[PDB]
């Protein structure tokens, strides 16, 4: 299975691009994704992916990545989403952790 053991950040600005350190159970650097998602009553989810190269996977037990941009960069209230590890080869996922996207401060 997959498991997120610790994350140094569980909130981020909707603009994305912010660096996060994630500690995990053993993964393989070319078979791992970090999936952000948000399930509305809808039929097809919103999703975004953590930005990192395989070299950012540290000794199979940690990943340093940048947050994806949230779907709406113009929100005025924080949006609660989820983050999970996903394996590319068999699409298995870790249990989801809550992640908070907060509004951008667009002045100066």
């Amino acid at each position: 299975n997959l498991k997120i053991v610790r994350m140094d950040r569980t909130a981020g600005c909707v603009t994305g691009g912010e660096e996060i350190y994630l500690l995990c159970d053993k993964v393989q650097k070319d078979d791992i994704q970090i999936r952000f998602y948000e399930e509305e009553e809808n039929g097809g989810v919103w999703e975004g992916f953590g930005d990192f190269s395989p070299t950012d996977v540290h000794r199979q037990f940690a990943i340093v990545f940048k947050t994806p941009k949230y779907k709406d960069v113009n929100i005025t209230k924080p949006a609660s989403v989820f983050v999970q590890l996903r394996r590319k080869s068999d699409l298995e996922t870790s249990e989801p952790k809550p992640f908070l996207y907060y509004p951008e401060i667009k002045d100066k």
Binding site: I4, R6, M7, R9, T10, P78, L100, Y102
Partner: protein, 295 residues
Amino acid sequence: KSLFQWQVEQEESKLANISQDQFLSKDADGDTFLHIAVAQGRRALSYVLARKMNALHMLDIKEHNGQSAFQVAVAANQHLIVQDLVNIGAQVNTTDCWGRTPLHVCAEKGHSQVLQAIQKGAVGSNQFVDLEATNYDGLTPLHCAVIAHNAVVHELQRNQQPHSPEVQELLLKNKSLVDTIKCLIQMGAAVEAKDRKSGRTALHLAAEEANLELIRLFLELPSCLSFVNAKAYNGNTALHVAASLQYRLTQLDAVRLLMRKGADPSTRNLENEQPVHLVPDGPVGEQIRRILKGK
């Protein structure tokens, strides 16, 4: 007729004048008159300016820091003014620009009277106080209070001088933070709430510092046996943490206290380790080992 009733009716006698373009206007910092009055502790003036802003539904105007006048009063530790503001409907469930709720600010600073003010004001304004709100660090207000108290305790067991302006300040903050924690719990805060980063409970957080006063406080709660063996994301319990610590003068007693109040020494983490497997090498770890095995 109490004095406050006099100065209030007296206040409105002096500023039934201002009016409506001058106190709704914002400073370069975004501060209205109420923000400043609140910060200065002008209870009578704050009451009047608030009532006039409230009628226009402009009570919760935020400055450049994302702080309403109510949020400013919280930070300023003006619990009298706080209660006045929340009573007439000031939004309790809000954040500043750093993502902190008024409860979080109370928790960090140990403003228990402010916290009690919020509780009363919310009752008299039909507001729901979200005790489990998380800040941008994934922490509930209880979490913040515990971490703040750990820092105080850790320093008290380190600075070598009573007469210092800081230590007497630390001593009072030691008391105020515990009072704040008690208030939060009395208000219904979940001790078993987990930090979003690591899955630590308030008990876990206390155990990290071998914080005897808080460990004792939490373990006395009715739900003690329901969270004493709670596991963080890495599978560790508070007993795992206590047994493994860098040497503190209160480490042994923390382990004893956890054992005595029902912590399970056979619990295993993600790597199948029990607390006994985590003890430091040498005599100290041997002493901890006996406590974990002994009755």
